[PDB]
CSV table of C-alpha atoms in Angstrom, one decimal:
chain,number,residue,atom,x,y,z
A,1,UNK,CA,15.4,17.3,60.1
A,2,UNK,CA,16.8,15.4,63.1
A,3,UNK,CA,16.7,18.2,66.3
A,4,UNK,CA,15.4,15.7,69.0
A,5,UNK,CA,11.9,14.2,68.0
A,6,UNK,CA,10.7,11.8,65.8
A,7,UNK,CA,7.6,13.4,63.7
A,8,UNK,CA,4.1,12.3,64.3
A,9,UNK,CA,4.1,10.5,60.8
A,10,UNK,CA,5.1,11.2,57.4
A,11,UNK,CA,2.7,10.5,54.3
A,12,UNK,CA,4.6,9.3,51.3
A,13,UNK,CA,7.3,10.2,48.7
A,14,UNK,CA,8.1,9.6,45.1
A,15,UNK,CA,10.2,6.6,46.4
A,16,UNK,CA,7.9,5.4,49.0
A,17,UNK,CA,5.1,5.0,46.6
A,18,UNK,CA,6.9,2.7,44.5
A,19,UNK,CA,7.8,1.0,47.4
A,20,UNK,CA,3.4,0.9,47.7
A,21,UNK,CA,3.7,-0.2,44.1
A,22,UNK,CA,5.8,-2.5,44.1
A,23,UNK,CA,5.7,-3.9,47.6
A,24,UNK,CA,3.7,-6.7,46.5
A,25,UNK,CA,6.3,-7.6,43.6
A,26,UNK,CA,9.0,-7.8,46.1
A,27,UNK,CA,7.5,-9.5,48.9
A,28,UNK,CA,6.2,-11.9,46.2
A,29,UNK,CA,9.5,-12.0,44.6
A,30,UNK,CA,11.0,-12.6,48.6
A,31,UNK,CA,8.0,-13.3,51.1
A,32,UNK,CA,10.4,-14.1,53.6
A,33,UNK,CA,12.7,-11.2,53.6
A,34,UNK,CA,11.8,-8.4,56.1
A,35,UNK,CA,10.4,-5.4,56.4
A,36,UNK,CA,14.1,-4.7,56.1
A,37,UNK,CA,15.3,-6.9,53.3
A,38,UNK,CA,11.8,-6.6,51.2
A,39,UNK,CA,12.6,-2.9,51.7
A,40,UNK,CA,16.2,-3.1,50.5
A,41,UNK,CA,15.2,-5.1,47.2
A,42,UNK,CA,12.6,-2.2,46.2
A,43,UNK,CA,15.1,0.7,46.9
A,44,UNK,CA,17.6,-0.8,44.3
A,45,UNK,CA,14.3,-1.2,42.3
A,46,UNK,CA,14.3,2.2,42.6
A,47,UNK,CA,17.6,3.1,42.2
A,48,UNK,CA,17.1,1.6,39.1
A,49,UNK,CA,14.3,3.9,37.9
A,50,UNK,CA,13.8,6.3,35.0
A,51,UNK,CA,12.6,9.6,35.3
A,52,UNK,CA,9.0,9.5,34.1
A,53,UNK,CA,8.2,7.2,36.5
A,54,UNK,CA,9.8,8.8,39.0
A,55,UNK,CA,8.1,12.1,38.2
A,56,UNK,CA,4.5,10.6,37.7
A,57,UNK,CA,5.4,8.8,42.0
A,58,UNK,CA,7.2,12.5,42.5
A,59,UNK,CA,3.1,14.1,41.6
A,60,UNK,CA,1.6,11.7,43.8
A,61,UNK,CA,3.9,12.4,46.4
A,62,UNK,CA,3.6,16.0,46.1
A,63,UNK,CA,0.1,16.1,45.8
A,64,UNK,CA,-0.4,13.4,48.6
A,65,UNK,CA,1.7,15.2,51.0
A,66,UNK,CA,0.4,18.6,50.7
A,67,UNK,CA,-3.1,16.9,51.1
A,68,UNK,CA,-1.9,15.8,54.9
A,69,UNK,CA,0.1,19.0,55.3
A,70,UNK,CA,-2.3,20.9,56.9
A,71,UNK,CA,-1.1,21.8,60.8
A,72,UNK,CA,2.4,22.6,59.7
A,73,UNK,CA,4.0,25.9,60.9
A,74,UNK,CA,7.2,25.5,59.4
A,75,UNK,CA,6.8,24.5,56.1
A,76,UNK,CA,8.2,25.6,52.5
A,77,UNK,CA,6.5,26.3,49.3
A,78,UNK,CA,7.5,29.0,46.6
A,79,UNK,CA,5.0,31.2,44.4
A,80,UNK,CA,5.3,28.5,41.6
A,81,UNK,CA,3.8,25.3,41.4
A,82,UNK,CA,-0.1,26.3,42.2
């Protein structure tokens, strides 16, 4: 959470990897937006999201995150999804 460091660096999420998807789209869509504003276009874009989509992103998340998670001492992960 927020105790009083900023982590080394996060891979990716459900949300984040439509924001990889459709990064493009949006910055096509609004070159000159920002980082900020290209950003606040795809979270509505996701927002506006069904589940199946956000399950199939929620996979690639979960399966691209435990990839990295590898020197992680205090982590979470109950006898079910293996």
């Amino acid at each position: 959470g927020s105790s009083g460091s900023s982590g080394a660096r996060r891979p990716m999420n459900a949300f984040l990897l439509f924001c990889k998807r459709h990064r493009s789209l949006v910055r096509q869509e609004h070159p000159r937006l920002d980082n900020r504003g290209a950003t606040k276009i795809l979270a509505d874009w996701w927002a506006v999201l069904d589940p199946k989509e956000k399950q199939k992103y929620t996979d690639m998340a979960k399966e691209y995150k435990d990839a990295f998670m590898k020197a992680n001492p205090g982590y979470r992960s109950g006898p079910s999804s293996g």
